[PDB]
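FAQ
Q: What does a multi-component entry look like?
A: The components come first, one per line:
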Amino acid sequence: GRSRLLEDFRNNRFPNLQLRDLIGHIVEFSQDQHGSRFIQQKLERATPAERQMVFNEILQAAYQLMTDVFGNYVIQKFFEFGSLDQKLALATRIRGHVLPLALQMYGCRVIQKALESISSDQQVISEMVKELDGHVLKCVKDQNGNHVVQKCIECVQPQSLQFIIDAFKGQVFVLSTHPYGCRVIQRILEHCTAEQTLPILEELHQHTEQLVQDQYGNYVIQHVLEHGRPEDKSKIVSEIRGKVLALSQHKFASNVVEKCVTHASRAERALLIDEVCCQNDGPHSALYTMMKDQYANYVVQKMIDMAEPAQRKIIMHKIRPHITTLRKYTYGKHILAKLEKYY
RNA sequence: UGUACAUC
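Then the predicted structure of the entire assembly, as tokens:
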């Protein structure tokens, strides 16, 4: 179960081995740790004829190599450097098995490579994508599958992805708090059409408070703040208003408040800063609490850099009476140069 | 001083 060529190769007997030396031994080498790397590296510069010689051998073991820990790299190399015909032939061996492969550690890498290598205009890719219909959430929740779903969204014509949008109906919030689901949701926000992202964004806005405080959900909300439409940033802002001081002190939500300050309009950014700038909450002002907090102090620094003229004047004036008193904290010892750059 | 994203 091991040709002599492979032994001598692994035993460093062939300092100048070449692709054409592997005639008849391609599938064997493709399953070997060093043989796979060797083939990968040689495929890049191989002639059309040499590449075809290789393809002819990988073809008869294609599916097997797709789920092989080393062989999968050889299959991918062909999606990168293969002819359109060789790529369509490999894809055809994927078709019929998309689901199992999507859920497989090495198979999912092959499917992903095919999606970025063949236009979604082709029937193979078109019919491949459709095999996921009826299993969308299963794949989203899978450690391997989720990456295939992300890949379809990034790569395939959005109109054909309506079955993915449909499968998230009613579960956008829940999946936005899921380690993998949050990634797929962001891909959707990036690549889908206005009609498709509409119901997605509606569900997000129905749970903003829970999302901004979630370990994954806060990324989904910042995405909208960073990349979304003004009408969606405004909805998010409306839910943050009346909550700035509170959310500012939260590990996750504090990043969302920073993003509201950065990507909100002039009148919105000031209404958020005013909430803590010219407002009050007992003996001291909201700024007093935020200054010393392990998280809110990052928000304070952000408002300072984004605030209007008359706004920064007040922020520094409420922070003024507590300067020397603000050294003990390991957190506030960074607002130091802060009140020395705009002071 | 503060949070996610997988193979040789």
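Q: Is there any commentary attached?
A: Sometimes. For this entry: Chain A has one domain: 1-343.
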